Design a protein around this motif. Structure first.
Motif, PDB file in Angstrom:
ATOM      1  N   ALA A 119       0.823  -1.201   0.000  1.00 36.48           N
ATOM      2  CA  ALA A 119       0.000   0.000   0.000  1.00 36.48           C
ATOM      3  C   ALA A 119       0.859   1.254   0.000  1.00 36.48           C
ATOM      4  CB  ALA A 119      -0.939  -0.009   1.205  1.00 36.48           C
ATOM      5  N   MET A 120       1.927   1.268   0.802  1.00 39.12           N
ATOM      6  CA  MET A 120       2.832   2.417   0.790  1.00 39.12           C
ATOM      7  C   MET A 120       3.493   2.585  -0.574  1.00 39.12           C
ATOM      8  SD  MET A 120       4.816   2.777   4.442  1.00 39.12           S
ATOM      9  CE  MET A 120       4.196   1.257   5.157  1.00 39.12           C
ATOM     10  N   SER A 121       3.937   1.477  -1.173  1.00 35.72           N
ATOM     11  CA  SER A 121       4.582   1.534  -2.480  1.00 35.72           C
ATOM     12  C   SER A 121       3.612   2.011  -3.554  1.00 35.72           C
ATOM     13  CB  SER A 121       5.152   0.160  -2.834  1.00 35.72           C
ATOM     14  OG  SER A 121       5.809   0.184  -4.087  1.00 35.72           O
ATOM     15  N   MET A 122       2.379   1.502  -3.526  1.00 32.50           N
ATOM     16  CA  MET A 122       1.372   1.943  -4.482  1.00 32.50           C
ATOM     17  C   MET A 122       1.037   3.413  -4.282  1.00 32.50           C
ATOM     18  SD  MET A 122      -0.964   0.458  -6.832  1.00 32.50           S
ATOM     19  CE  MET A 122      -2.207  -0.769  -6.440  1.00 32.50           C
ATOM     20  N   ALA A 123       0.956   3.857  -3.026  1.00 27.90           N
ATOM     21  CA  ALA A 123       0.676   5.261  -2.754  1.00 27.90           C
ATOM     22  C   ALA A 123       1.765   6.155  -3.323  1.00 27.90           C
ATOM     23  CB  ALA A 123       0.525   5.483  -1.249  1.00 27.90           C
ATOM     24  N   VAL A 124       3.030   5.821  -3.054  1.00 27.43           N
ATOM     25  CA  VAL A 124       4.106   6.680  -3.535  1.00 27.43           C
ATOM     26  C   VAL A 124       4.207   6.623  -5.057  1.00 27.43           C
ATOM     27  CG1 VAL A 124       5.907   4.931  -3.193  1.00 27.43           C
ATOM     28  CG2 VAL A 124       6.501   7.359  -3.219  1.00 27.43           C
ATOM     29  N   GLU A 125       4.029   5.442  -5.658  1.00 28.06           N
ATOM     30  CA  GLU A 125       4.080   5.340  -7.112  1.00 28.06           C
ATOM     31  C   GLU A 125       2.952   6.120  -7.772  1.00 28.06           C
ATOM     32  OE1 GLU A 125       1.791   3.411  -9.054  1.00 28.06           O
ATOM     33  OE2 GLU A 125       2.793   3.726 -10.981  1.00 28.06           O
ATOM     34  N   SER A 126       1.726   5.983  -7.262  1.00 29.98           N
ATOM     35  CA  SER A 126       0.593   6.676  -7.860  1.00 29.98           C
ATOM     36  C   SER A 126       0.707   8.182  -7.676  1.00 29.98           C
ATOM     37  CB  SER A 126      -0.712   6.152  -7.264  1.00 29.98           C
ATOM     38  OG  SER A 126      -1.835   6.730  -7.903  1.00 29.98           O
ATOM     39  N   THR A 127       1.124   8.635  -6.488  1.00 29.30           N
ATOM     40  CA  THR A 127       1.282  10.068  -6.289  1.00 29.30           C
ATOM     41  C   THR A 127       2.421  10.634  -7.124  1.00 29.30           C
ATOM     42  OG1 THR A 127       1.293  11.808  -4.601  1.00 29.30           O
ATOM     43  CG2 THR A 127       2.853  10.010  -4.305  1.00 29.30           C
ATOM     44  N   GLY A 128       3.504   9.882  -7.327  1.00 33.23           N
ATOM     45  CA  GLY A 128       4.561  10.333  -8.207  1.00 33.23           C
ATOM     46  C   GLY A 128       4.110  10.414  -9.648  1.00 33.23           C
ATOM     47  N   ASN A 129       3.391   9.388 -10.111  1.00 34.28           N
ATOM     48  CA  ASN A 129       2.889   9.385 -11.479  1.00 34.28           C
ATOM     49  C   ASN A 129       1.897  10.510 -11.731  1.00 34.28           C
ATOM     50  OD1 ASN A 129       2.732   8.444 -14.102  1.00 34.28           O
ATOM     51  ND2 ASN A 129       2.306   6.323 -13.502  1.00 34.28           N
ATOM     52  N   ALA A 130       1.010  10.790 -10.779  1.00 37.20           N
ATOM     53  CA  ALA A 130       0.072  11.898 -10.903  1.00 37.20           C
ATOM     54  C   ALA A 130       0.751  13.256 -10.809  1.00 37.20           C
ATOM     55  CB  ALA A 130      -1.015  11.796  -9.830  1.00 37.20           C
ATOM     56  N   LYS A 131       1.651  13.439  -9.840  1.00 37.30           N
ATOM     57  CA  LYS A 131       2.366  14.692  -9.681  1.00 37.30           C
ATOM     58  C   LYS A 131       3.277  14.998 -10.858  1.00 37.30           C
ATOM     59  CE  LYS A 131       5.605  15.187  -6.517  1.00 37.30           C
ATOM     60  NZ  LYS A 131       6.715  15.866  -7.240  1.00 37.30           N
ATOM     61  N   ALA A 132       3.869  13.990 -11.496  1.00 41.67           N
ATOM     62  CA  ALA A 132       4.672  14.230 -12.687  1.00 41.67           C
ATOM     63  C   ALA A 132       3.838  14.814 -13.821  1.00 41.67           C
ATOM     64  CB  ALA A 132       5.332  12.926 -13.141  1.00 41.67           C
ATOM     65  N   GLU A 133       2.733  14.148 -14.161  1.00 40.06           N
ATOM     66  CA  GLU A 133       1.865  14.603 -15.237  1.00 40.06           C
ATOM     67  C   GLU A 133       1.131  15.888 -14.891  1.00 40.06           C
ATOM     68  OE1 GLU A 133       1.346  13.946 -18.384  1.00 40.06           O
ATOM     69  OE2 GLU A 133       3.050  12.571 -18.239  1.00 40.06           O
ATOM     70  N   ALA A 134       1.004  16.217 -13.606  1.00 39.55           N
ATOM     71  CA  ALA A 134       0.393  17.468 -13.188  1.00 39.55           C
ATOM     72  C   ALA A 134       1.378  18.627 -13.156  1.00 39.55           C
ATOM     73  CB  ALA A 134      -0.253  17.297 -11.808  1.00 39.55           C
ATOM     74  N   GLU A 135       2.601  18.405 -12.681  1.00 39.24           N
ATOM     75  CA  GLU A 135       3.632  19.426 -12.591  1.00 39.24           C
ATOM     76  C   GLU A 135       4.276  19.742 -13.927  1.00 39.24           C
ATOM     77  OE1 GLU A 135       6.640  18.686  -9.529  1.00 39.24           O
ATOM     78  OE2 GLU A 135       6.245  20.749  -8.885  1.00 39.24           O
ATOM     79  N   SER A 136       4.377  18.768 -14.836  1.00 38.07           N
ATOM     80  CA  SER A 136       4.790  19.097 -16.194  1.00 38.07           C
ATOM     81  C   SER A 136       3.797  20.052 -16.839  1.00 38.07           C
ATOM     82  CB  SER A 136       4.923  17.823 -17.027  1.00 38.07           C
ATOM     83  OG  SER A 136       3.664  17.197 -17.204  1.00 38.07           O
ATOM     84  N   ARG A 137       2.501  19.780 -16.665  1.00 37.95           N
ATOM     85  CA  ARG A 137       1.474  20.677 -17.181  1.00 37.95           C
ATOM     86  C   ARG A 137       1.561  22.047 -16.522  1.00 37.95           C
ATOM     87  NH1 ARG A 137      -1.935  17.290 -16.645  1.00 37.95           N
ATOM     88  NH2 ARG A 137      -1.493  16.335 -18.678  1.00 37.95           N
ATOM     89  N   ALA A 138       1.779  22.083 -15.205  1.00 38.01           N
ATOM     90  CA  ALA A 138       1.914  23.349 -14.493  1.00 38.01           C
ATOM     91  C   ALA A 138       3.121  24.160 -14.949  1.00 38.01           C
ATOM     92  CB  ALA A 138       2.004  23.098 -12.988  1.00 38.01           C
ATOM     93  N   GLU A 139       4.279  23.528 -15.135  1.00 34.77           N
ATOM     94  CA  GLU A 139       5.470  24.204 -15.632  1.00 34.77           C
ATOM     95  C   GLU A 139       5.277  24.713 -17.056  1.00 34.77           C
ATOM     96  OE1 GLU A 139       7.872  26.170 -14.902  1.00 34.77           O
ATOM     97  OE2 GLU A 139       8.860  24.684 -13.626  1.00 34.77           O
ATOM     98  N   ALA A 140       4.683  23.887 -17.922  1.00 39.78           N
ATOM     99  CA  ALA A 140       4.398  24.330 -19.281  1.00 39.78           C
ATOM    100  C   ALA A 140       3.441  25.513 -19.276  1.00 39.78           C
ATOM    101  CB  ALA A 140       3.827  23.176 -20.104  1.00 39.78           C
TER     102      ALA A 140
END
Lengths: 51, 50
Positions: B1-22
């Motif tokens: 559960a911890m691994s899934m949480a960190v992986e999912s939050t990283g995957n979401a934050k990457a696609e969200a922060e790339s959009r924010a930076e752009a």
């Protein structure tokens, strides 16, 4: 950008107004003076009798 | 559960922060183009005013 255009068109419209009123003015002075000569040519009682 | 949480939050934050930076780069670009186009209009309409 727009304010300069609006200001420029404003003074043009003011002078265009002077063009319009002068056109109405002088064309009516001649219209009135011609009527002055027209009715003076006939006579006061004569125009009444004609009408 | 911890691994899934960190992986999912990283995957979401990457696609969200790339959009924010752009979007930040696009905002800065847009305001600079707004300044440049403002100068362009303010000189084009000024000359056309004459």
């Amino acid at each position: 950008r727009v304010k300069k255009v609006r200001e420029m068109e404003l003074i043009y419209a003011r002078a265009q107004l002077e063009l319009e009123v002068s056109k109405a003015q002088q064309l009516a002075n001649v219209e009135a003076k011609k009527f002055k000569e027209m009715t003076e040519a006939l006579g006061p009682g004569t125009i009444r009798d004609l009408a | 559960a911890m691994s899934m949480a960190v992986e999912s939050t990283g995957n979401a934050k990457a696609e969200a922060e790339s959009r924010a930076e752009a979007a930040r780069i696009e905002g800065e670009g847009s305001v600079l183009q707004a300044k440049l186009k403002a100068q362009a209009l303010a000189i084009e309409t000024e000359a056309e005013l004459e």
